């Protein structure tokens, strides 16, 4: 019935779909305030009451839908700037086991905004693309150290992103399950 | 970087019999069959470095 590759996990398309439901801040280039939108899964007042160059908050999928056309501009999140990413890299280097406290959707949102909204950043984009890479590489080192503690009981993780978890899910759970089977078989 | 003059039609000829010590450092013109040939190698031109072919 359901496809074989969706029995236990989410595909990256579903991960993008999940991230798209979050709110984001925009500057509209038109006034809607005095037809009306009449949505059923969100607030409707914000879109009906827009005024040009007045900041407002909407779901990300509608924000990208507007930015497709002239009608809108997207404000970048404050963590997505050179100063903050510098500090997070320094945190990563300083604490050789803890993960730095980046938001749960950082990879997905960065790789959406760099494609759909390359024109709306303040920093030069060719530097952000480097610092995002540095963060992902350091985190991958820390992941490879952690896979030596798979065990029969449990594990704790902190600040690991959704896409990063979903990348690893079928390996961690499978090896952990087999260690559990081997151990309990000796008890019985 | 450099050009070589080739002389042609030198008006006197020897076989490999008639050569004597008086011919030393003189120009000569000779005829025969080529019996054996080596491979080509580079050779140091000046004694920064430069080379030339040799056989």
């Amino acid at each position: 019935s359901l496809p074989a590759h969706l029995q236990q996990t989410f595909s990256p398309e579903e991960i993008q779909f999940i991230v798209e439901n979050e709110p984001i801040k925009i500057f509209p280039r038109i006034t809607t305030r005095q037809t009306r939108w009449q949505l059923i899964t969100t607030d409707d007042k914000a879109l009906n009451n827009m005024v040009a160059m007045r900041s407002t908050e909407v779901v990300l999928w509608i924000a990208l839908l507007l930015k497709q056309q002239s009608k809108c501009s997207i404000v970048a999140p404050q963590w997505l700037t050179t100063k903050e990413l510098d500090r997070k890299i320094q945190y990563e280097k300083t604490h050789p086991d803890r993960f730095s406290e980046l938001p749960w959707n950082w990879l997905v949102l960065a790789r959406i905004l760099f494609n759909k909204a390359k024109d709306d950043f303040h920093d030069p984009i060719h530097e952000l693309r480097g610092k995002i890479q540095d963060l992902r590489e350091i985190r991958q080192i820390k992941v490879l150290k952690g896979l030596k503690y798979l065990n029969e009981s449990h594990l704790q993780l902190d600040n690991l992103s959704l896409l990063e978890i979903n990348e690893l899910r079928p390996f961690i759970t499978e090896i952990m399950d087999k260690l559990r089977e081997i151990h309990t078989a000796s008890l019985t | 970087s450099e050009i070589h003059v080739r002389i042609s039609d030198f008006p006197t000829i020897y076989s490999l019999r008639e050569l004597r010590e008086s011919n030393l450092s003189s120009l000569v013109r000779v005829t025969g069959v080529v019996t054996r040939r080596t491979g080509v190698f580079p050779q140091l031109k000046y004694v920064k470095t430069v080379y030339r072919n040799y056989q």
């Binding site: 890479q133 590489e137 350091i138 080192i141 | 580079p42 050779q43 072919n53 040799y54």
Partner: protein, 533 residues
């Protein structure tokens, strides 16, 4: 002094920054190589030129000096992307610059990057070179170390910690080494000027470029062209290499299985063999059995039971060539053989030695002989052992050895030697003018059912998957028939060595169907086809 640091800084910033679209291709490649414990990087010239032409200019002017700087830059990046120890990484290059024919290389090209191509003709064994090396000072017993790199060195004489004129020795107990190999490249056959034998070069490679090619292969090479010491003021040239260029699926066996359940498969394979040859039905049937073979067996008391088939043919030239093409492994020869070894083997001379003919060389496959009557005197007696035992044994001039001869023989000619074969037949002809006209029209066309490769792969699959056994009904049938023929001959010879041949034919017939058991259906066709006479 500072130039060595600026150059290293430049290549370090190259690896960390080269994007084409959205992927940092050299950072990703360098990380993915370390995970499989491959310490090298394959850079492409065109990307280096695109990034900054000045770097390529420096590299193009002085390659012997600048290649080591780029290699150490790679190591410095490799640590950042994987550590919060590693050897020095090997740089490898790809290029599309114009090829130089091997015959045109000369004194203008010494210490330049050169791209060329040819055929490899020889390969040395591996040998050891030093990279990190430790030193002991004989007088004071002080110690130090040195770092070699392999570009165009000797032990030093500045003694330390008087300390003497030449006091240094090597501690092999605390030093590091790498692999090195030599190769020979010969110019392309379709380039050579007429009436001359081809020219060749010698060349060197180390670490991951070693053990990558074999003799007889055509290759393309990127490397530094240089000279070494070995007339007056004269030296030998060579090349330092920096890069080189040169079972079934499920969907396959499904076709073979569909063929296996076809009700007329035997007819189909017979029809597919030498289709131009008219008539000769039973000849084609026998060649199918020769290609498929029986089943090998081994018993508790160690006796060993043969699997091969042997056939003799008394037009006939075409079939042996066809068998040579369709068979998975094949050898073709005329009765005098390729050397004084003849068909089987012989001793030659100065010390004596031994060499095998075209029975030993075809071991494991099929061999076909084009005129069996032109067999030499020694081979006439030696083929008895080669066929009955599947071996050849010699004890002459102090040599004492035994050789393997595990093969199926096809033979043709135009006596007691016929007893060695399982089946014998005489080729037959027909003289239809349309056939000759068709052949002639095809000859003019070139001058102006199952295909071979599919059939060869199918034969391979069947030989690998199945080895069938006689059912009890077949045993009663065969034994009754055997005693019947001997009784008929007695009241008017058949012998066990022919019963054991009929069994092999029966198994080979069951093998086409992939049936694990042989049945009376196969026994009937086996005795029907046994009418050699």
């Amino acid at each position: 002094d500072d130039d060595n640091t600026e150059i290293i800084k430049s290549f370090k910033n190259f690896i960390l920054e080269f994007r084409l679209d959205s992927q940092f291709i050299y950072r990703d490649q360098l990380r993915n190589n370390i995970l499989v414990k491959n310490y090298s990087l394959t850079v492409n010239m065109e990307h280096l030129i695109g990034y900054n032409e000045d770097i390529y200019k420096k590299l193009s002017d002085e390659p012997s000096d600048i290649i080591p700087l780029f290699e150490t830059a790679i190591t410095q990046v490799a640590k950042r992307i994987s550590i919060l120890s590693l050897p020095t990484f090997q740089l490898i290059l790809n290029s599309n610059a114009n090829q130089i024919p091997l015959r045109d290389l000369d004194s203008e090209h010494v210490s330049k990057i050169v791209r060329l191509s040819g055929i490899i003709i020889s390969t040395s064994v591996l040998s050891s070179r030093a990279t990190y090396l430790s030193i002991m000072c004989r007088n004071c017993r002080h110690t130090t170390s040195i770092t070699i790199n392999n570009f165009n060195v000797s032990l030093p004489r500045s003694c330390l910690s008087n300390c003497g004129p030449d006091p240094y020795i090597i501690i092999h107990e605390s030093s590091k080494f790498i692999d090195q190999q030599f190769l020979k490249l010969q110019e392309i056959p379709e380039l050579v000027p007429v009436g001359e034998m081809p020219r060749n070069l010698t060349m060197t490679c180390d670490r991951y470029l070693t053990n990558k090619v074999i003799p007889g292969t055509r290759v393309t090479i990127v490397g530094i062209y240089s000279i070494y010491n070995s007339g007056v003021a004269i030296r030998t040239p060579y090349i330092k290499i920096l890069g080189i260029q040169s079972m079934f699926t499920e969907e396959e066996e499904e076709e073979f299985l569909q063929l296996s359940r076809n009700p007329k498969l035997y007819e189909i394979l017979t029809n597919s063999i030498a289709p131009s040859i008219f008539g000769n039905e039973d000849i084609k049937k026998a060649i199918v059995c020769l290609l498929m073979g029986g089943s090998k067996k081994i018993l508790p008391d160690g006796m060993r039971l043969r699997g091969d088939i042997n056939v003799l043919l008394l037009a006939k030239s075409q079939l042996l060539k066809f068998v040579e093409k369709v068979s998975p492994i094949a050898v073709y020869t005329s009765g005098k053989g390729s050397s004084a070894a003849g068909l089987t083997a012989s001793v030659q001379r100065r010390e004596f030695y031994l060499e095998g003919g075209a029975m030993v060389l075809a071991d494991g496959g099929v061999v076909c002989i084009d005129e069996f009557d032109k067999m030499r005197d020694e081979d006439r007696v030696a083929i008895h052992e080669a066929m009955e035992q599947q071996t050849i044994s010699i004890a002459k001039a102090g040599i004492t050895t035994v050789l393997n001869s595990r093969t199926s023989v096809l033979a043709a000619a135009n006596t007691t030697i016929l007893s060695r074969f399982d089946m014998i037949f005489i080729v037959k002809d027909d003289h239809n003018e349309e056939r000759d006209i068709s052949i002639a029209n095809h000859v003019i066309n070139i001058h102006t059912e199952i295909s071979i490769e599919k059939m060869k792969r199918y034969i391979t699959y069947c030989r690998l998957k199945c080895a069938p056994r006689l059912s009890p009904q077949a045993a009663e049938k065969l034994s009754s028939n055997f005693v019947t023929i001997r009784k008929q001959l007695l009241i008017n010879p058949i012998t066990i060595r022919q019963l054991e041949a009929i069994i092999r034919i029966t198994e080979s017939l069951a093998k086409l169907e992939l049936s694990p058991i042989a049945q009376e259906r196969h026994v009937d066709e086996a005795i029907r086809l046994f009418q050699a006479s």
